[PDB]
């Protein structure tokens, strides 16, 4: 308890309730994009989403049981993965495009505006394609997003045992969702595997996006907020 006392249905409800809003970008259609202005939109957006993410994390069962140092660590490790999975989810109904915001829907050709960015766009688009192929459900999405938060920094650590118990609960929850959806027992483990294997790809994209963001910072392309600077610095 109390996280470990939740039923699968209660876990799903808590996570669905905790979901942050879809935010708007500062996109100004009065001027053409430059590398600096496109990067500025994404970093400004990331910064505003981060505040909502921090408050979402506090609503993920088990998270607030950790010390502040451990909460900081998990968010530092997972933040870009979490932003990216959210982007990929928003983008599912938009083949070939990334819905960064409702007023900022970009294709890979627009991604070329920022040096090194098109490669990352292509990975995100492939991931969105995979979600579509799998018909990923919203209830499954929120479970995966919480798994990222709890898992990504867990092997950079009792506290650990607590986290693994919560992770097991989310596994039970995914399985419950799939069974309620009418999947056979074999289909259940197969899909559980397919979903969790995507998290390897999301880690990879986050690592590449982090390298890219560091490159933008080191070339003075855009001013990062103090918060973004510290989240980036956590990755060395």
């Amino acid at each position: 308890s109390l996280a470990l006392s939740l039923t699968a249905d209660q876990m799903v409800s808590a996570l669905l309730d905790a979901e942050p809003p879809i935010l708007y970008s500062e996109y100004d259609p009065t001027r053409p994009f430059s590398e600096a202005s496109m990067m500025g939109l994404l970093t400004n957006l990331a910064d505003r989403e981060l505040v909502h993410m921090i408050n979402w994390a506090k609503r993920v069962p088990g998270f607030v049981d950790l010390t502040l140092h451990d909460q900081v660590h998990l968010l530092e490790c997972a933040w870009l993965e979490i932003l990216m999975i959210g982007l990929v989810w928003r983008s599912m109904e938009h083949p070939g495009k990334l819905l960064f915001a409702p007023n900022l829907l970009l294709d890979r050709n627009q991604g070329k505006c920022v040096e090194g960015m098109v490669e990352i766009f292509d990975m995100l688009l492939a991931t969105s394609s995979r979600f579509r192929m799998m018909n990923l459900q919203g209830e499954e999405f929120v479970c995966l997003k919480s798994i990222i938060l709890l898992n990504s920094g867990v092997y950079t650590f009792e506290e650990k045992d607590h986290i693994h118990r919560v992770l097991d609960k989310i596994t039970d929850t995914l399985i419950h969702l799939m069974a309620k959806a009418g999947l056979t027992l074999q289909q259940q483990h197969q899909r559980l595997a397919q979903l969790l294997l995507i998290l390897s790809h999301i880690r990879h994209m986050s690592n590449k996006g982090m390298e890219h963001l560091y490159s933008m910072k080191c070339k003075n392309v855009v001013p990062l907020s103090d918060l973004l600077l510290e989240m980036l610095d956590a990755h060395r």
């Binding site: 921090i54 506090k58 502040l68 909460q71 900081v72 968010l75 530092e76 103090d226 510290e230 989240m231």
Partner: peptide, 9 residues
Amino acid sequence: KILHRLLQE
């Protein structure tokens, strides 16, 4: 650290 402060608000 800013995140540390933000986690308490």
